[model samples]
Target chain A: TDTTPPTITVPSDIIAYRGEEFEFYFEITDDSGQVKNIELSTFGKPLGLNWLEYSEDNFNVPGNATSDNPLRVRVHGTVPLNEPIPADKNRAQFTRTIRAWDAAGNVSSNITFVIKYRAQTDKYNPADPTITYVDRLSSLSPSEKNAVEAAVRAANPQIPAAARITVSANGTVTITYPDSSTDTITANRVVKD
Target chain B: RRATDTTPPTITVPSDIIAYRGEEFEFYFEITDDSGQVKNIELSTFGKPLGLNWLEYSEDNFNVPGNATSDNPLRVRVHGTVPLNEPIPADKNRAQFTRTIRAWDAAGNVSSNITFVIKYRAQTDKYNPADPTITYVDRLSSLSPSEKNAVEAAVRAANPQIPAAARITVSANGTVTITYPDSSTDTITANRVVKDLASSR
Candidate 1:
C-alpha cells in the first residue's frame, strides 16, 4: 500500500590494470514493499539522462527486490584493462556514467567511477615505497616532461605557455589536474593512484 | 589586432571516469584560444594495452572556440557518444581508449597534443554518504589476500583527500563499500587492481 521509489548507493572510483576487468555495483532499497522493473543506462546528455533497458539479470530477483534484502547486481559488461602511456597519470577517466530507475517511475542519479591503469603486473609496492626521483628521474623523457609541463601550463594560463618548469636532479613536480587545481611538489615526484 | 590561435584546446578529464558495459561514455574539454577563433577541433584515440598509434576520428570541426563555452575560457569537448560504442567481447578485456585532442587554426598549425584516457568498469554500483560504516571484509573467493589489502590501502590513500573522515569495507558479496565521516557512502566492485598503489603493505 505504498508508492515510493528506491534510494541508490553508488561508487566514486576504481583502479584497474590494462588487462583487468572493470566492475560496477549499486544498491536500491524501496520502502514500498518491493521494487521492480529495474532499468539502467549510461552515456547520456547531462550523463544518464537518456534511459535504456539493460538486459542483464543484474538483480538476484527477477520480479521485485524487497526492501529487506535490497537489490544487488553486476550490471554486466567488462571494461578490459588498458594502460595509458607510461607514467601518463597512471589512470584514465573511466568516463562512463551508470544510472538506474525502478518500476515506481523514479530514476537514480548517475555516478562517475574511475579506473586507473598501469603495467599488468603493476601492483602497489610496499617494499620500496620510498622510490624517489633520484632513482627514476633519469628515466623521465623529454616527451613525458613536455606532457606534464604542457598540462600544467595549459591549465594555468597565468604561467606563460612558453615558460616551462625545469625538473633536474630533483624530480620537482608541478601538476595541474583536469579540475584546474594545481599541486607543486618540493621533493621528488609523488605518484598517485 | 587578432591574437594568434597558436594554443591548442585545453581539455579537462573528469577526476572519476568509468565506461560501463555497452554504454557510451563522455569526456569534456576546455578549448581556449587567445585569439578567440578556432577553425576545428579533432579527438583521436589509441587502442589499449600498449596505447599505441592514433586512430583519429573522421569527424572533425567540433566547436568553434568561442561559440560553445564550458568554462570561463570555453571548454570545447567532444560528444561522449561520438568516439565509441560498447566494446566487443574480444576486446572488452583489453579494450582501452586514449583520446588525443588537437585543434587546427587558420594557418593549419596543430596545437600541442593533449591526451585523455577513457577507461572502463563493469556493473551497477551505489554509494550513499549517509550509510553507517559496515564491517570491512577482505578476501573474496576470487580476490587474493594481497588484493584485499590493496583495497584497504586504496581507501586509506584516498581517505585524507576525500574531504571527510571515511571508512571503507570490502564486503564478502564482492561489494567494496565506503562511508565517510560525513556519513556519505560509496561502493565499488573489487574488479580493479588498486591503481594509485604507491604504498606497499
Candidate 2:
C-alpha cells in the first residue's frame, strides 16, 4: 500500500587537485518506516579507472536507516599522482549517481554529482622549459620567444652550451657559442646559418 | 679546394598505421650518412592535423664523428597521440593524416623525404544523444514472450550507447520500461511507445 518512494540528497559538485583526498556524502530518507537498499554507481567508467590510487571504500553497506533518522552515505577517494593531464583541458569531470529503495520496493529517483579533478597546469605554458614549443610562431611574445629559444638550446646539447642566443619574431633562433660556433633554428628546423 | 661531401643522408620509412582515437602511437627510423654526422631532423604534417611529441636522435645523443652510419645509424623515434575529443565527420567513420620526416647531414645535404599514413578511427560506436528513458513496464500479462523480446532487442540496438546491462521490458499494452544500473527507471506509455517504435524501426 506504500507507494511513496525514497528521496536522496546528494552533495554539490566538487573540485579537488590531483594527489589530494576528497569526500562526498549523501543523505537518504523514506516516508515508509524503513529503507531497504541504497546503491551508488557511476554513469560510465568509474573515476577509479582513470587512476589506480582511487580508494575502494567509496560506499557504505546497506543499513543505517530508521523512521526517525535518515540513512547516511559517505564516498571518499584520492586523486592519483599519475593521473594523466589532458592536453586540452585543465580539469577532468566525473559523474556519479545514487539511488535508494524503501521497504515497499519503490525506488527513489536517481541523484547525480560531479567531481572535477584539477590538473597541475591549466594550459600550455610557452615559458615552461620542459615543453617543446613549436608551430606557435605568431602567439609568442618577445619574452616567450626568448624562453622557447632557451628551451630549444637547452634541450639540444648538440648545440653549444655557453651560447649567446637571440630569437626573431619570425620564429628564428640564433645561437652563437663561446667559440663563435653559430647555429640557428628557422621554422623549428636546426641549421648552421 | 677541400673535397666536398655532397651525398645526402639515407632514411628508412616505417609502414602506415591504423590508429584509434584517444590512443598513443609511435614509429621509428634510422638516418645514416656517409659523413656520419646528422645536423638536423625536420618533421612536418599534411592532410588533417597531427602533432608530434618528439622527433629526435635517440642513439648516442647525436654525438659527432660516427653519429650516422650503417652500423651506428642515427636512430629516431616519432611519437604522437591522437586527440580524444576530435569530432569525426558525420559522413565518415574515420579520418586520415600524413606525417613527413626529413633529416640533414652535417654538410647540409638533406635526406630524401619519407611519408607515412595514419588512419584514425573512432574509439567506439557513435553515441545516441536522444536515448529514451523507460521506468516500469505496465500490463506485463498482456504481451507474449516473442513480442516482448522483439521490442527489447530493437530498443537496445537503437541505443547502443546505453549500458548493455540495463534491463528493458515491454508489454502488449504499448508500454516500455528501462531499468538502469543506478536503480533509476524510465517509463514510456502508449503514445510514446508508438513514437519510440517508429524511431527504433
Candidate 3:
C-alpha cells in the first residue's frame, strides 16, 4: 500500500460573500507520480467524481507535483474550474479532498479548506455594506465609499489598513489595504461589510 | 492577454425525425468553445420566401461556461401549430420546414450551423385561411379598384398561413366564410383597416 500521502496547502482565511459567487485557488503537492482527483463542496454536500470539479482534461497532473502544476478540472475537457464560493447554503466550511490512485491502490491523506462567507464590516456604519468581501468596494456608492473609507481607516490607522481601492464595472475588484496588502479579483467583487 | 480564439464551435444533431401538425420535436446539439465561454444559441426556421428572419428565443442564459462542451449539450423543443388526423402530403400551400440551429462564443467565434428537416401535416382543426368560402370575395362591384385589389392581395398573402385542410370562400355578395378543418370558422368582415400585433410579434 502506498501510504506516503501528498502535501497540500489550502489557502487560509478565505473570506466569501453570502449569496454570490466567490472563487479562489489553493495548492496541492503529491510525491507520487500522479494526482487523480480534487473534490470540493459546500455545506457538507458530498463532492462526487461527477462534480464539475474533476477530469484528466482540467487537472493537469505533472511529473513533479507542485502548485505550478495545481489541479484543474473541466467538464468537456476544456473549461477549467470556474468555481464559485457556496453562497446558497451557509455557515459551513468547504470540504475538500485530494486523491491519488495508482496501480497498487495507493493511499494518500487529504486536506480540507474552510471558506467563511460573512457580512464583515469596518468600524464605520455597518448598514449598507454590500460587503460581499472584506475589502472589495464595488457595490458602494460614493457616500458609502466615503463612510467605509473612514471606518476602515479608523479601524486600522495602521499602515496595512490604509486604503487604495478600485471598483470594476465587470465585477472585478482591486484593493490595497493600509498595511500594503493587495488583492485583485476577477469574481463578482462586492467587498466590505 | 489571452490569445485570440479562432476555432469555431463544434456542432451536432443527434437524430433525423419526421413531424406532424400538433407535434413537438426536440432540437438538440452540442457545441464547445475554446475561448472560455459560449455566448448564446440561436435557432431559425425557413420562412415563406424573402420572409427569412431569426425568431429569437430567450436563451441569453443559453450557456453555462462551456456547458456547450461535449460533456453537456444544449437542447430545445418546438411544437406544431396543428395536428394531423390523417396521413396528408406536403402540397404547394401546405409545406415542410427546415430548422437551423447554432451557437456563438465570447470571442466572436461561431459554430457551424446544423439543421433539422421534417415533413409535417396539420391537425383536423385549426386555421386554414384558404377554406372554400375564402377562394374569392366574388362580390364588391360597389368598391373602388384600390379596395378590391387590396382584398385580393390580402387573400394571397394570408392564404399560406391557413391550415391546409381548411377552406375559405368569398361569396359574390361581399360575404366571406371560412370553414376550418375542424368545421369551425373565424370570420373577418373588415373595412380594410390597419391593426397591430405585439411582444411575441
Q: TM-score: which candidate is best?
A: 2
Runs of candidate 3 with Cα error greater than 4 angstroms are A1-193, B45-60, B77-94, B122-201
DockQ of candidate 2 against the true complex: 0.01
Report the lDDT tens digits of candidate 2 across residue range A1-193.
Answer: 8898888877775765555567766677777655776765674334344342222232233444545666766666776644665665434766776677876689877678677776423211122134435344553433345455557756666533333455565556655443233455564452121
- What docking class should model 1 receive? incorrect
Deviation of model 2 at B6, angstroms: 0.8
- TM-score for each model: 0.26, 0.31, 0.26
Interface RMSD of each: 18.9, 31.6, 33.7
Tell me the tens digit of each residue's lDDT in model 2 across B36-125. Answer: 888767667743333644223344456477878889887777656656445557665347767777778888788766787766665443
lDDT of 3 by residue, A83-133 (tens): 333455454344445444432345445556655544222211212223343
Better of 1 and 3 by DockQ: 1
Q: Interface root mean square deviation for model 3, in Å?
A: 33.7
The residue-by-residue lDDT of candidate 1 on A62-173, one tens digit each, is 3445556666655433333322434456334345555545555565556444444444333322111232222235444323333444344444454322222333323455
| lDDT for A54 (candidate 2) | 24
**Chain B vs. true chain B: TM-score for each candidate?**
0.41, 0.52, 0.44
| Global local distance difference test of model 3 | 0.45
